[PDB]
Design a protein around this ligand. Structure first.
Ligand SMILES: C[C@]12CC[C@H]3[C@@H](CC[C@H]4CC(=O)CC[C@@H]43)[C@@H]1CCC2=O
Ligand SMILES: C[C@]12CC[C@H]3[C@@H](CC[C@H]4CC(=O)CC[C@@H]43)[C@@H]1CCC2=O
Lengths: 125, 125
């Protein structure tokens, strides 16, 4: 069973791996047949290869990632609020999404969706 | 056509309605075949009648509801972090869930899922 402690630990590990640029660390949290929809509304990317490619590309820039509130976890799901800060096109940018994870029996993330829109993307020029 | 601005406005109306105990106002935001899963993992309430009953029971005891961060809205979906505060017989409780709304083309909410676990239910004060 997915304990709240496990799902919370996985969310923390995810954020830590992103903040450190640990690609293998991020991918290791996902099932081999998992799906990533980032952002919500974009083409779903499934399978280890597609997931690795997505994060590999995201990590081409140093990302400062931090949780901004307590993790919500119940049943086999977790949701969390956080910020991702980086410099893009010579402008300080802070994105504030809410991510949602679904876990399987092995405690692996089988589906992740990052919900953020244009109004959650803050570029300070 | 359902847009990000519309969904965000609906989340604001939803929170204001919860604070006013406006059952009709809350229900008016949902589609006829909408569903409510509170909390995530429990049997979903389906249809106007069931949804109304859910909110009637959920608001018997007055709730102070507040968005704690910006609303996230994109492609027919929205997610928001907030708190629900109430007191009963001297016992204060603050619940911090993350809600996920899915909207249909007509701009009505077809799905509401409230993700929170016991770790998100804070007693004491
Ligand atoms: C700034 C940006 C949106 C915010 C996106 C960024 C690409 C990397 C991802 C990585 C994240 O983890 C949070 C959101 C951020 C886009 C590049 C083009 C664009 O518009
Ligand atoms: C049942 C409950 C009040 C109703 C709250 C619920 C937490 C999730 C939120 C989600 C909503 O969008 C509607 C109101 C509902 C509380 C858990 C503890 C409690 O008393």
């Amino acid at each position: 069973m997915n304990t709240p402690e496990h799902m919370t630990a996985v969310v923390q590990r995810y954020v830590a791996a992103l903040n450190a640029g640990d690609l293998d660390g991020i991918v290791a949290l996902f099932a081999d047949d998992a799906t990533v929809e980032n952002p919500v509304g974009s083409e779903p990317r499934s399978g280890t290869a597609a997931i690795r490619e997505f994060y590999a590309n995201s990590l081409k820039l140093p990302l400062a990632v931090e949780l901004t509130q307590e993790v919500r976890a119940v049943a086999n799901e977790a949701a969390f609020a956080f910020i991702v800060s980086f410099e893009y096109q010579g402008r300080k940018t802070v994105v504030a999404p809410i991510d949602h994870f679904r876990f399987n029996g092995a405690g692996k993330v089988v589906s992740m969706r990052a919900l953020f829109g244009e109004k959650n993307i803050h570029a300070g020029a």
